Design a protein around this ligand. Structure first.
Ligand SMILES: Cc1cc(O)ccc1C1=CS(=O)(=O)C=C1c1ccc(O)cc1C
Ligand SMILES: Cc1cc(O)ccc1C1=CS(=O)(=O)C=C1c1ccc(O)cc1C
Lengths: 230, 9, 238, 9
């Protein structure tokens, strides 16, 4: 397993180099069917890139095929959310779904029951801004989500999770933080994952509500990921 | 499933 | 604030002595369990545990220093998380079993009843198996449970709200590190264990959400009717 | 409100 033999600097560079591209939404006031239409198309395309990104996460390739499936099925919405939150960081009060799709919570109300998650998403972004979350920390958290979210449903996964913790502390040691400041912010970072988990679960509930209402015929891939949560 | 095919290529 | 004045040793002591008691169930093993009976026992048990938890929360350092509609908010968000991590903790020395009460020890085949709870049971067991694997300490448990109380609802919040909450959370972090440092753990081992412990909270949040949805299912299902307090906490998920 | 009594009671 090469993931464990990597220095934390190599781990950082490896994660950075695996970062998926920022996709665009299709171009051109929204209803609830049109807004959901854009988001569904975008989310489905982001999924494809995420799955290929996961194969480039150090140690994920070492897992068996259906263990990779389990972790991706459990954490796909979390990963999509923390991604949305990260690129929306420099746009306070707004969520940057795409460079040509920047929305505020007032526009989030067009879709029923979406405004709750938006505020939670916006609150997560404001927290990242407050902590001045760095890109190297973000990619560490995202891969942590990928490995941790479904691991409790294994030693090698905990093996890799420890090295990312070492990678995090290493990064924060580079930024001139004292020992105390290092496990404090480390704790702060990891506690965010509890909220992201909460958003995902409430987000999962909202999409299943959109399936049984059938306004947008969800993607078969998106349906497979959604039906996986039961 | 679709996830299968995407993880194999 | 005196919670910020507490040494990490004083932090543990305050948390240890504030622990709730292990309540007993009205369980009668003379009869084989059903669904309404089992659900009735658990509901009765959880409700009485809620009362103690509410009084436990008031003793958590820093919690008393907040307004009502904040304590209310934190408890509304974290109550099931706290009930679950408490259950998991007292079930630690019983592999493959959940100790709801000293006289109510259940495995995953009796939990296979009540419809859709057996999945949650397996998750509760997997967490207990994880605590056993890490050999979780009581000093670490009381910290984690206090972290859950203050953290789970802080993100759903003018007058400097959370700077005090996050600051108490920062000292509980220092307390955990203290604890590991005395256990003989190296600095690298301290950070790692700190991470492993906090990642559990993510899974605990997940169980709570699933459990929350499962409880909402149960009395539109109209089996054994809930305590009025549980229904209050349950309608906070809206 | 029960959890509204137990907090100050
Ligand atoms: C996942 C999803 C699927 C769908 O079909 C409709 C909407 C959402 C969605 C709901 S939300 O939670 O407001 C954010 C997203 C979202 C959408 C597109 C993205 O590229 C990323 C995200 C995180
Ligand atoms: C919370 C709950 C409420 C209810 O009315 C019926 C059942 C449960 C429950 C279902 S579960 O998630 O299997 C575990 C519990 C549970 C029960 C009693 C406890 O003292 C603690 C817990 C955590």
């Amino acid at each position: 397993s090469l993931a464990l033999s990597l220095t934390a600097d190599q781990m950082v560079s490896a994660l950075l180099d695996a970062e998926p591209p920022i996709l665009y939404s299709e171009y051109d006031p929204f209803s609830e069917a049109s807004m959901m239409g854009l988001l569904t198309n975008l989310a489905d395309r982001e999924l494809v890139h995420m799955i290929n990104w996961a194969k480039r996460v150090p140690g994920f390739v070492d897992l068996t095929l259906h263990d990779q499936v389990h972790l991706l099925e459990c954490a796909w919405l979390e990963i999509l959310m923390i991604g949305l939150v990260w690129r929306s960081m420099e746009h306070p009060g707004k969520l940057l779904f795409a460079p040509n799709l920047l929305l505020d919570r007032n526009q989030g109300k067009c879709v029923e029951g979406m405004v709750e998650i938006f505020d939670m998403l916006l609150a997560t972004s404001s927290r990242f801004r407050m902590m001045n979350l760095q890109g190297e920390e973000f990619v560490c958290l995202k891969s942590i989500i990928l490995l941790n979210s479904g691991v409790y449903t294994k030693d090698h996964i905990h093996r890799v999770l420890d090295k990312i913790t070492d990678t995090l502390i290493h990064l924060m040691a580079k930024a001139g933080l004292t020992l105390q400041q290092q496990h404090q912010r480390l704790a702060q970072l990891l506690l965010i994952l509890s909220h992201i988990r909460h958003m995902s679960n409430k987000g999962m509930e909202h999409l299943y509500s959109m399936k049984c209402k059938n306004v947008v015929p969800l993607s078969d891939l998106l349906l497979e990921m959604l039906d996986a949560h039961r | 499933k679709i996830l299968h095919r995407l993880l194999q290529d």
